[PDB]
Scaffold this active site. Structure first.
Site, PDB file in Angstrom:
ATOM      1  N   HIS A  40       0.878  -1.282   0.071  1.00  0.00           N
ATOM      2  CA  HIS A  40       0.130  -0.239   0.017  1.00  0.00           C
ATOM      3  C   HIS A  40       0.760   1.081   0.082  1.00  0.00           C
ATOM      4  O   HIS A  40       0.271   2.325   0.025  1.00  0.00           O
ATOM      5  CB  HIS A  40      -1.051  -0.073   1.195  1.00  0.00           C
ATOM      6  CG  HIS A  40      -0.317   0.245   2.677  1.00  0.00           C
ATOM      7  ND1 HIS A  40      -0.321  -0.858   3.584  1.00  0.00           N
ATOM      8  CD2 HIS A  40       0.237   1.285   3.207  1.00  0.00           C
ATOM      9  CE1 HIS A  40       0.345  -0.114   4.731  1.00  0.00           C
ATOM     10  NE2 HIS A  40       0.555   1.022   4.382  1.00  0.00           N
ATOM     11  N   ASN A  54      17.929  11.832  10.602  1.00  0.00           N
ATOM     12  CA  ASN A  54      16.978  12.866  10.564  1.00  0.00           C
ATOM     13  C   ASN A  54      16.484  12.907   9.090  1.00  0.00           C
ATOM     14  O   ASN A  54      17.246  13.135   8.312  1.00  0.00           O
ATOM     15  CB  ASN A  54      17.467  14.107  10.849  1.00  0.00           C
ATOM     16  CG  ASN A  54      16.544  14.997  11.105  1.00  0.00           C
ATOM     17  OD1 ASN A  54      15.727  15.279  10.418  1.00  0.00           O
ATOM     18  ND2 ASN A  54      16.686  16.224  12.240  1.00  0.00           N
ATOM     19  N   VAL A  57      17.515  16.622   7.694  1.00  0.00           N
ATOM     20  CA  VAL A  57      18.926  16.951   7.863  1.00  0.00           C
ATOM     21  C   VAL A  57      19.691  16.177   7.107  1.00  0.00           C
ATOM     22  O   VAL A  57      19.838  14.776   7.369  1.00  0.00           O
ATOM     23  CB  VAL A  57      19.166  17.153   9.091  1.00  0.00           C
ATOM     24  CG1 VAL A  57      20.665  17.966   9.072  1.00  0.00           C
ATOM     25  CG2 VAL A  57      18.464  18.029  10.001  1.00  0.00           C
ATOM     26  N   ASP A  84      -0.055  -7.782   1.774  1.00  0.00           N
ATOM     27  CA  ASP A  84       0.704  -6.158   1.800  1.00  0.00           C
ATOM     28  C   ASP A  84       2.247  -6.551   1.782  1.00  0.00           C
ATOM     29  O   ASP A  84       2.862  -5.997   2.746  1.00  0.00           O
ATOM     30  CB  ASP A  84       0.253  -5.431   2.934  1.00  0.00           C
ATOM     31  CG  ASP A  84       0.372  -4.078   2.800  1.00  0.00           C
ATOM     32  OD1 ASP A  84       0.957  -3.523   1.786  1.00  0.00           O
ATOM     33  OD2 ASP A  84       0.357  -3.355   4.020  1.00  0.00           O
ATOM     34  N   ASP A 171       2.894   1.413  20.008  1.00  0.00           N
ATOM     35  CA  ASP A 171       2.418   0.771  18.629  1.00  0.00           C
ATOM     36  C   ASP A 171       3.058   1.620  17.674  1.00  0.00           C
ATOM     37  O   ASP A 171       3.704   2.600  17.507  1.00  0.00           O
ATOM     38  CB  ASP A 171       0.750   0.951  18.607  1.00  0.00           C
ATOM     39  CG  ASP A 171       0.181   0.380  17.376  1.00  0.00           C
ATOM     40  OD1 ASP A 171      -0.666   0.980  17.038  1.00  0.00           O
ATOM     41  OD2 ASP A 171       0.829  -0.658  16.772  1.00  0.00           O
ATOM     42  N   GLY A 175       2.520   6.543   8.758  1.00  0.00           N
ATOM     43  CA  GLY A 175       4.070   7.014   8.273  1.00  0.00           C
ATOM     44  C   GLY A 175       4.768   5.630   8.106  1.00  0.00           C
ATOM     45  O   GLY A 175       5.334   5.428   7.206  1.00  0.00           O
ATOM     46  N   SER A 177       4.376   2.782   8.147  1.00  0.00           N
ATOM     47  CA  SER A 177       4.076   1.723   6.917  1.00  0.00           C
ATOM     48  C   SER A 177       5.140   1.255   6.196  1.00  0.00           C
ATOM     49  O   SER A 177       5.658   2.085   5.630  1.00  0.00           O
ATOM     50  CB  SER A 177       2.882   1.908   5.994  1.00  0.00           C
ATOM     51  OG  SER A 177       1.919   2.840   6.644  1.00  0.00           O
ATOM     52  N   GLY A 178       5.333   0.036   5.944  1.00  0.00           N
ATOM     53  CA  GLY A 178       6.359  -0.377   4.916  1.00  0.00           C
ATOM     54  C   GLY A 178       7.575  -0.916   5.743  1.00  0.00           C
ATOM     55  O   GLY A 178       8.741  -1.691   5.255  1.00  0.00           O
TER      56      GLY A 178
HETATM   57  N1  LIG Z   1      -1.824   1.279  14.573  1.00  0.00           N
HETATM   58  C1  LIG Z   1      -0.850   0.858  13.603  1.00  0.00           C
HETATM   59  N2  LIG Z   1      -0.052  -0.010  14.054  1.00  0.00           N
HETATM   60  C2  LIG Z   1      -0.914   1.418  12.400  1.00  0.00           C
HETATM   61  C3  LIG Z   1       0.099   1.083  11.362  1.00  0.00           C
HETATM   62  C4  LIG Z   1       0.359   1.567  10.090  1.00  0.00           C
HETATM   63  C5  LIG Z   1      -0.833   2.299   9.790  1.00  0.00           C
HETATM   64  N3  LIG Z   1      -1.277   2.588   8.434  1.00  0.00           N
HETATM   65  C6  LIG Z   1      -2.320   3.361   8.672  1.00  0.00           C
HETATM   66  N4  LIG Z   1      -2.798   3.106   9.856  1.00  0.00           N
HETATM   67  C7  LIG Z   1      -1.953   2.300  10.545  1.00  0.00           C
HETATM   68  C8  LIG Z   1      -1.887   1.878  11.816  1.00  0.00           C
HETATM   69 CA   LIG Z   2      19.582  12.816   6.701  1.00  0.00          CA
HETATM   70 CL   LIG Z   3       8.663   5.234   9.056  1.00  0.00          CL
HETATM   71 ZN   LIG Z   4       6.990   6.454   7.967  1.00  0.00          ZN
HETATM   72 ZN   LIG Z   5      -0.181   3.000   6.338  1.00  0.00          ZN
END
Ligand SMILES: NC(=[NH2+])c1ccc2nc[nH]c2c1
Ligand SMILES: [Ca+2]
Ligand SMILES: [Cl-]
Ligand SMILES: [Zn+2]
Ligand SMILES: [Zn+2]
Length: 223
Positions: A40, A54, A57, A84, A171, A175, A177-178
């Site tokens: 995704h 960072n 930077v 996924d 948790d 962001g 994700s992946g």
């Molecule tokens: N709660 C999580 N671990 C989570 C992780 C990735 C996601 N991407 C959209 N929602 C998310 C929720």
């Molecule tokens: Ca950097």
């Molecule tokens: Cl990340």
């Molecule tokens: Zn991220």
């Molecule tokens: Zn996600």
């Protein structure tokens, strides 16, 4: 990552940032030319940034390389987020050093109980929004399939596992994700989804990488 800590310089050296003008997802380097992330996170025009701490930077330790191609799993379902996983090939090989290393694929799946390290630059506020610029880490265990499935009824497949704490607090989040979930030195999970972030009874759900190792190895070898 919510409730995690600042990893530090090059402690998760296999961590990658996926950038399309800004950082939008995470990934794991598996060898000089390939990266595994979540399906995704697919976007066209991806630039991979390695040796990042960072993301706002440039500290002279990075390698910014563009992807030459992306392969989303043949069975990826964007509705259920089953399968996924996606592979991203790099244009040029990254130069592996202390700051950039690859992570290993597992020979077997990890058991509930096992302690994993989850890392990323995603949101850090459960009730709110805060986007850190340094890498955040979180040590979390794999939960039992029953505790995972009671939390998301009719939604977990054999290709997913849950990790975290049910008391909420720490948790993975938007962001991240992946990004990687490494247990005993092997890449066992990919951040995939969850119910909001760190809520009570809502652990994160991860792609169970041990079910895709032959597809990974075969796909990389013919591309
Ligand atoms: N709660 C999580 N671990 C989570 C992780 C990735 C996601 N991407 C959209 N929602 C998310 C929720
Ligand atoms: Ca950097
Ligand atoms: Cl990340
Ligand atoms: Zn991220
Ligand atoms: Zn996600």
């Amino acid at each position: 990552i919510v409730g995690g800590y600042t990893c530090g310089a090059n402690t998760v050296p296999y961590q990658v940032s996926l950038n399309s003008g800004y950082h939008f997802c995470g990934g794991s380097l598996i060898n000089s030319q390939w990266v595994v992330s979540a399906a995704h996170c697919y976007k066209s025009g991806i630039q991979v940034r390695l040796g990042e701490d960072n993301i706002n930077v440039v500290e002279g330790n990075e390698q910014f390389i563009s992807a030459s191609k992306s392969i989303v799993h043949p069975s990826y379902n964007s509705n259920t987020l089953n399968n996924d996983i996606m592979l991203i090939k790099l244009k040029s090989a990254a130069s592996l050093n202390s700051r950039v290393a690859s992570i290993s694929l597992p020979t077997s799946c990890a058991s509930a109980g096992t302690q994993c390290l989850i890392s990323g630059w995603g949101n850090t506020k459960s009730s709110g929004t805060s986007y850190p610029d340094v890498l955040k880490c979180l040590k979390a265990p794999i939960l039992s399939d029953s505790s995972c499935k009671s939390a998301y009824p009719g939604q977990i497949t054999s290709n997913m596992f849950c990790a975290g704490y049910l008391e909420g607090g720490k948790d993975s989040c938007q962001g991240d994700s992946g990004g990687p979930v490494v247990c005993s030195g092997k890449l066992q999970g990919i951040v995939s989804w969850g119910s909001g972030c760190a809520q009570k009874n809502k652990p994160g759900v991860y792609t169970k990488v041990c079910n895709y190792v032959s597809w990974i190895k075969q796909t990389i070898a013919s591309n």
